[PDB]
Amino acid sequence: EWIPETLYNTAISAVVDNYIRSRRDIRSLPENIQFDVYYKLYQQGRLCQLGSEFCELEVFAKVLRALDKRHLLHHCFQALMDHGVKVASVLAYSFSRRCSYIAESDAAVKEKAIQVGFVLGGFLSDAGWYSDAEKVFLSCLQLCTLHDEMLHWFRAVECCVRLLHVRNGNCKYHLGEETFKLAQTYMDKLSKHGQQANKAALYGELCALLFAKSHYDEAYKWCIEAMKEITAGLPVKVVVDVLRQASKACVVKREFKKAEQLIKHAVYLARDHFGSKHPKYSDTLLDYGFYLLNVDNICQSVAIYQAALDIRQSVFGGKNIHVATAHEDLAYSSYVHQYSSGKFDNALFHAERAIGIITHILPEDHLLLASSKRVKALILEEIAIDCHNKETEQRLLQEAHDLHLSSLQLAKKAFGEFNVQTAKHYGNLGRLYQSMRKFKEAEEMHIKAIQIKEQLLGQEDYEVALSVGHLASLYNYDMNQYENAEKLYLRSIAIGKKLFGEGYSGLEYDYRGLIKLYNSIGNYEKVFEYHNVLSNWNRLRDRQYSVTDALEDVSTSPQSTEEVVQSFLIS
Amino acid sequence: TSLKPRVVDFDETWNKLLTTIKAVVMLEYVERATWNDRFSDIYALCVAYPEPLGERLYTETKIFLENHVRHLHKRVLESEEQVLVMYHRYWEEYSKGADYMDCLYRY
Amino acid sequence: QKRASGQ
Amino acid sequence: MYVKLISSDGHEFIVKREHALTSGTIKAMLSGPGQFAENETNEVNFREIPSHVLSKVCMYFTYKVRYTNSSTEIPEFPIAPEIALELLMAANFLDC
Amino acid sequence: MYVKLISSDGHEFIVKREHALTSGTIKAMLSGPGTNEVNFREIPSHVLSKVCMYFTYKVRYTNSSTEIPEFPIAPEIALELLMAANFLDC
Amino acid sequence: DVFLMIRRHKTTIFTDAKESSTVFELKRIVEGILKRPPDEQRLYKDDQLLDDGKTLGECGFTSQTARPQAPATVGLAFRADDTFEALCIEPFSSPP
Amino acid sequence: DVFLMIRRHKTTIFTDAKESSTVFELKRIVEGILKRPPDEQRLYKDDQLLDDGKTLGECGFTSQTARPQAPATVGLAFLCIEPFSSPPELPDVMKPQ
């Protein structure tokens, strides 16, 4: 149609083409214009002319007030970080140095810089630079501690709710508890002095910290406490933040009726306000796909991580931890979904991507690098079985052995010996030893895996049953201890149908194993007794398979706020 | 004087704009010179240095309109038995006094 | 495939 | 029919009404109590916009209308790099 | 035991001698002909005060068990102080 | 269609005309703006005489050299006290 | 420990003192170099005389606000404390020009 360009979009391209002469005068332009000049520099690809200005804190304070075009700033910021220049670490250090100089000032200048820190530290934390956002908040925190009145106590607890969030994406859990304890010190002081603070966002972080350390018993306790303080006056960003973390603790609690209403309300609440492109919406989808994968709704769990990844791949550039986290979970979901098929080439690409990103931006001994490392190892051991080349079978299976042990060490260093995540690596390493023909070694890993999970989770739980089936296949298919395997298969059968029914698609490896269990010990009557149940499993799975996609399952306005909270709280 | 951002005292601009916004809403007479002058004062507040006074401008206007309609509300509730004539007399002034004020606040 | 989905 | 844009220093820039209604501010400046027209020519007294840029805005106004949804490729607007800044500040103020 | 540290504008900044020995130039100024006053006609007083503030900051915080706080160098003074740091070799 | 910038003193009228359109009707456009008679106004185009007849094709400029991107200036002046005054156009402003 | 500077006209005393010490012993430190009688010398922080009876901690010279990098100030008189100098006023860059 050949429509001419607006005079604005023409004057933008004429001051950018004359940027060297006009760099001094551009910084004096209004915020809406100034960001559009800088975004034009990114569009032209002149990142050096741009990162020379974002490294200054004052300019990055001006381009942080453009809230409409923040989604363009994240892609412009992430492009700088991959370009070279450490624009995140320079901004965080340049703020801490400037923040440390106004300690001997009044409460007007200090509140000006604290608000800069809350939008800068609120941006680096949003872009994934948790190790660099914490340095901003730790400087904002020490501004609130200087003045000990009722006014600044509400900001010190506003830093500690954010410090507790940048210390979980950075997997610094052992500092998280000390942060929460310091928050209560600034909460009890404020609450006692005739001013009650909303303790809803802060307890939501503990619903993810204690979830991360596999304290699901403690996670659900703070899940209830978080939602008891949900008020309609809270920001939607805070409210959707509590819901997604509350869902993750409820799903791992293996109760799914209360879990769906929390996260489907969260996805709706993060889609009507934030829209289908804001990273927070994709953040909710990532936790929504956690619900789908644990309820055996694996078919549409891949489609919700792919949606979650595609949002983050557009807002958060190439090499970002948030993109890498989506690559990790999508690789795991594609691993689970296509486990039966045995084809892992898209899943391997996603798992390899999540390591090519995290190893670039995180140290070699980071906990989040360990969880993303186990997913490649799970994929590698299946390729090391499906491939028919013995040389490839041995070497690829050995590579997956170094990844689990490296992943186990990082989990064992921070989560301790007695945790589900540490035991989750024992079970994965147990399955690997089964494929490595080390059936003697595979016995003691699963025994240590079940004993840790049984002691912590309980005698009957979904995670315990899924670990037993790993041991049951060991005692049945390649160790010939059918008497020992007889109770193990039955143990997982009861738990498997306890929370999913007979149509649980994971029972295929449980029912078929029972058929091979009875094939070598006689009693062929029970072979047909389990043979029709496998057909019953076939009938009860494909009939319920036909269901609409979860993206439209939430639809438009399914329920209302302050109603899902009350419905969940009373139950 | 150029249209680049500059430091401006809110009270002087808001007082110089409160008289125009009071006459725009009530469909009074504001000259062409002042109405076109008042667009620059709106702009100079949304790009004012160091802090953009766009939030203060929108809050003070919100307080001003909330003051105005409840002022018209007191001039209608007291006029019983003729509310319908008084409401529409005060509505066609305000319905045009909102779109006109929407144009002034376009930036 | 006999060990079900890896945890 | 004709709109008499006045610059900061008093330079009139009489242009057609249809051309000068592609500017969001000038559309809003004429709408309202700005219709108390002197003859049929409404004047606009830009207090801040200088004359040397207001011509380039007006020369843009005829540039937008003539080349609107044109069949041929549109020549780029000739913008002097010395005034690419004062025109940039007056390209969002006027919304043109 | 005290060193008369005058400035360009005739401003004296006397401090303990062991504190003034951090900078290698002042140690060289004390050596030779003339614990007395030393000419500082180039360095101004507003930046030499920060040097003297650094002197007690350096000596007191040597081999400190706790983390040493950042020495504050104001933006308006940073460039002039840096040349003073090099000239004094502090 | 050639775009012009008929300007005198401060006024900077923006109009348009065909390539072969007559110069007289161009004065008629200005006639209906400042309500001056067509013979009252004199087009001092580039400080050279321009007769009331003629045409824009041989006036000295074409459509391409007076494009809407940067239209060419055309002077104007009226007759006062039974004599025609010279053109008194001045540059717009000094851009910083 | 409390670090302070003592300024009468332009002399400056960068000498540390304990937070529990009294003004009396700090006055003896001044006479070590200024070689003047201590009774004549009087000190004036924020243009306010300090009693010799009260210790350093009672004058607001807390060790937590008397760091070596930014020691607190105190006047002296036998006030004419002239400023050191005016550092060059660096441009704010983002200010319009």
From Swiss-Prot, chain A:
Keyword set, alphabetical order: Cytoplasm, Cytoskeleton, Membrane, Microtubule, Nucleus, Protein transport, Repeat, TPR repeat, Transport, Ubl conjugation pathway
Location relative to the cell: Nucleus; Cytoplasm, Cytoskeleton; Membrane
Summary of activators and inhibitors of this protein: E3 ubiquitin-protein ligase activity of the CRL2(APPBP2) complex is inhibited by APP.
Tagged with keyword Repeat: yes
TPR repeats: 44-77, 114-147, 200-233, 282-315, 327-361, 423-456, 465-499, 508-541
Oligomeric form and interacting partners: Component of a CRL2 E3 ubiquitin-protein ligase complex, also named ECS (Elongin BC-CUL2/5-SOCS-box protein) complex, composed of CUL2, Elongin BC (ELOB and ELOC), RBX1 and substrate-specific adapter APPBP2. Interacts with APP; APP interaction inhibits the E3 ubiquitin-protein ligase activity of the CRL2(APPBP2) complex.
Pathway terms, separated by semicolons: Protein modification; protein ubiquitination
Name under which the protein is recorded: Amyloid protein-binding protein 2
Functional summary from the UniProt entry: Substrate-recognition component of a Cul2-RING (CRL2) E3 ubiquitin-protein ligase complex of the DesCEND (destruction via C-end degrons) pathway, which recognizes a C-degron located at the extreme C terminus of target proteins, leading to their ubiquitination and degradation. The C-degron recognized by the DesCEND pathway is usually a motif of less than ten residues and can be present in full-length proteins, truncated proteins or proteolytically cleaved forms.
Gene: APPBP2
Cellular component, GO, one term: Cul2-RING ubiquitin ligase complex
SUPFAM superfamilies in UniProt: TPR-like
Main location: nucleus
From Swiss-Prot, chain B:
Domain of life: Eukaryota
The organism of origin for this protein: Homo sapiens
Subunit organization: Component of multiple Cul2-RING (CRL2) E3 ubiquitin-protein ligase complexes consisting of CUL2, Elongin BC (ELOB and ELOC), RBX1 and a variable substrate-specific adapter; this complex is also known as ECS (Elongin BC-CUL2/5-SOCS-box protein) complex and may consist of CUL2 or CUL5. Component of a ECS(VHL) or CBC(VHL) complex containing CUL2, RBX1, ELOB, ELOC and VHL. Component of the ECS(MED8) complex with the probable substrate recognition component MED8. (Microbial infection) Interacts with human respiratory syncytial virus (HRSV) protein NS1.
Location(s) in or outside the cell: Nucleus
Domain notes: The Cullin neddylation domain restrains the RING domain of RBX1 in the E3 ubiquitin-protein ligase complex; this restraint is removed upon neddylation of the cullin.
Post-translational modification, as annotated: Neddylated; which enhances the ubiquitination activity of ECS (Elongin BC-CUL2/5-SOCS-box protein) E3 ubiquitin-protein ligase complexes. Neddylation leads to structural rearrangment in the complex that allows interaction between the E2 ubiquitin-conjugating enzyme and the acceptor ubiquitin. CBC(VHL) complex formation seems to promote neddylation. Deneddylated via its interaction with the COP9 signalosome (CSN) complex.
Residue stretches spanning the membrane: none
The protein, known as: Cullin-2
Family statement drawn from the similarity comment of this UniProt entry: Belongs to the cullin family.
Curated annotation (Swiss-Prot), chain D:
Source organism superkingdom: Eukaryota
Example GO biological process: transcription initiation at RNA polymerase II promoter
Primary subcellular site in the record, as a coarse category: nucleus
Keyword annotations: Host-virus interaction, Nucleus, Transcription, Transcription regulation, Ubl conjugation, Ubl conjugation pathway
Disulfide topology: none
Post-translational changes noted in the entry: Ubiquitinated by the DCX(AMBRA1) complex, leading to its degradation by the proteasome.
Alphabetized SUPFAM superfamilies for the sequence: POZ domain
Record's keyword annotation contains Nucleus: yes
Sequence similarity: Belongs to the SKP1 family.
Role of this protein: SIII, also known as elongin, is a general transcription elongation factor that increases the RNA polymerase II transcription elongation past template-encoded arresting sites. Subunit A is transcriptionally active and its transcription activity is strongly enhanced by binding to the dimeric complex of the SIII regulatory subunits B and C (elongin BC complex). Core component of multiple cullin-RING-based ECS (ElonginB/C-CUL2/5-SOCS-box protein) E3 ubiquitin-protein ligase complexes, which mediate the ubiquitination of target proteins. By binding to BC-box motifs it seems to link target recruitment subunits, like VHL and members of the SOCS box family, to Cullin/RBX1 modules that activate E2 ubiquitination enzymes. Component the von Hippel-Lindau ubiquitination complex CBC(VHL).
Protein name: Elongin-C
Taxonomic source organism: Homo sapiens
High-level lineage: Eukaryota, Metazoa, Chordata, Craniata, Vertebrata
Swiss-Prot record, chain F:
Subcellular location: Nucleus
Major place of residence: nucleus
Secretion signal span: none
Domain Ubiquitin-like: 1-65
Superkingdom of origin: Eukaryota
GO annotations of cellular component type: Cul2-RING ubiquitin ligase complex; Cul5-RING ubiquitin ligase complex; cytosol; elongin complex; nucleoplasm; VCB complex
GO aspect biological process, one term: transcription elongation by RNA polymerase II
The entry's keywords: Acetylation, Host-virus interaction, Nucleus, Phosphoprotein, Transcription, Transcription regulation, Ubl conjugation pathway
Single GO molecular function: ubiquitin protein ligase binding
Phosphothreonine sites (modified residues): 83
Pathway stated in the Swiss-Prot or TrEMBL entry: Protein modification; protein ubiquitination
Function: SIII, also known as elongin, is a general transcription elongation factor that increases the RNA polymerase II transcription elongation past template-encoded arresting sites. Subunit A is transcriptionally active and its transcription activity is strongly enhanced by binding to the dimeric complex of the SIII regulatory subunits B and C (elongin BC complex).
Annotated family: Belongs to the Elongin B family.
Assembly and binders: Heterotrimer of an A (ELOA, ELOA2 or ELOA3P), ELOB and ELOC subunit. The elongin BC complex interacts with EPOP; leading to recruit the elongin BC complex to Polycomb group (PcG) target genes, thereby restricting excessive activity of the PRC2/EED-EZH2 complex.
Record-given protein name: Elongin-B
Organism, scientific name: Homo sapiens
Part of the intact protein present: 2 to 97 of 118
